[PDB]
């Protein structure tokens, strides 16, 4: 994620936005408001950068 | 000058980019350098990567109405064709509703 | 009824004269080779190419183009090298000293011996012909090498070496080269001469072999130089790049020197309609598609 | 058509492709009994009224 | 199955907007003609998504 | 600059330049009208489905 | 401002500006009518059950 600012002539690398992948995505327990929580059926997440 | 004297007040700089098509349009006919466009890379019109100028002259808009009007007809037909796909997608769903 | 898998028709489309310089089209079967940042290799048919901040040939979406690398001095294309990303560098090239200079001179058999017996550099009649040859050193300086033809007797020519760009050069007086032609004026031997210039500005002098091969003294009326070539060039700067019909990328410089930066590889699959589309208009090799089977754009059915 | 187990079936719908090895096969991975091998570096394939 | 049809309209609308811009921007001395470019998308396989 | 009594400046216009620019201006003005007509039809088909 | 004897002023109304504004205005009205047409059918379907 980068921010274009007025007086820097170049974007500033604010930070990194990874994501977590499970091997049992169907096993996640769903709660309200489009949120899934990790359970025992779903494996332990391993956060990674996109594309890897 | 009034006394047969010539003075120089500077020379106009020219800008060449290592990669075009990255100059984001900014309102009026100006461009702003950014990523995927290279550094400003200032230079001189004398020789090299920069061409020669011409006093008292201007360039056209490089836009020809003949090539734009014909593309308008093609573009219009593709829009109407897409509008047929959405229309037949409504009817096919409408039949399934009442059934 | 079960869907038995879709298929894509791979018949060639219609080419349109878009213009520009960085756009190509393939008139027959063939796919461009593309790679991602992760290193995986993709195949596509998009002709839209653009540079980036890194001066690499990239598609409109951000995938680098791969091809045969150009290596060596002078750089040349290699058809036995693995595919590599194609890049147009902006770095200036350095000068290369002239090493092999060859000229062709047509002489007159009906040319009488000059009247003045002692050779003179300040008198034109002392030499039958004058020959200026530009020679470049490892710095870029131009050596105005002057070669003088003098005919002393029948079917015999005296060739001397003289330099004008060197203020410290010594005026030649002795014979530097002897040329004898055959019965019919055909050159036989003695046409290879080692000529070394004079050092200027602290730069080592240019050493090169001078060739008078393919020269005849048969009567042509007046002396005429029909050819003059050399293999030295001053340092140049990047100006423009052009893509030929062979896929080679050639950049023009100040001294009109062509520098080959690689050529585009074309991959043809043993079977189409087996490629799996990946996001944008690119394809990834998999089963039911065979090996890449790379090749040049010239022959090999590509 | 030569079925994978070893027997021979017969089909009426003709829509053929090429496998990765160069054999002329129908959609589904089933090869033709005469085993017509389409060679590589091929420009086009022509079939007349006869089977040639 | 409106996803593909909807995405088609946006491309054609964008294509007509650029063409309308070029014809209107004629006689502007410091102007360069624009042109749009599309690219198909494939999420899974065997089906397109616009 | 110096003046000159008994002299007057012209209108510094060229009839030839204006006549040819008149033809170009009209075509451009009709050309944009095609865009409006195209935008009219392209929106008419969508509203009427 | 200054006056002028023997003159009159126009309506400062440009036909070209007004005519094109009528075209876009008409399409805006028709788009609004579609919502009423949609609101009628969506309500008609519900009541019919």
From Swiss-Prot, chain A:
The chain holds residues 157 to 208 of 260 of the full protein. It is found in: Bacterial flagellum basal body. The gene is flgG. The keyword Ribosomal protein does not apply. The keyword tRNA processing does not apply. This is Flagellar basal-body rod protein FlgG. GO terms for biological process: bacterial-type flagellum-dependent swarming motility. Belongs to the flagella basal body rod proteins family. One of its GO terms (cellular component) is bacterial-type flagellum basal body, distal rod. Keywords: Bacterial flagellum. The basal body constitutes a major portion of the flagellar organelle and consists of four rings (L,P,S, and M) mounted on a central rod. The rod consists of about 26 subunits of FlgG in the distal portion, and FlgB, FlgC and FlgF are thought to build up the proximal portion of the rod with about 6 subunits each. It comes from Salmonella typhimurium (strain LT2 / SGSC1412 / ATCC 700720).
Curated annotation (Swiss-Prot), chain C:
One of its GO terms (biological process) is bacterial-type flagellum-dependent swarming motility. The keyword Plastid does not apply. The keyword DNA repair does not apply. It comes from the Bacteria. It is found in: Bacterial flagellum basal body. This is Flagellar hook protein FlgE. One of its GO terms (cellular component) is bacterial-type flagellum. The chain holds residues 52 to 353 of 403 of the full protein. Keywords: Bacterial flagellum.
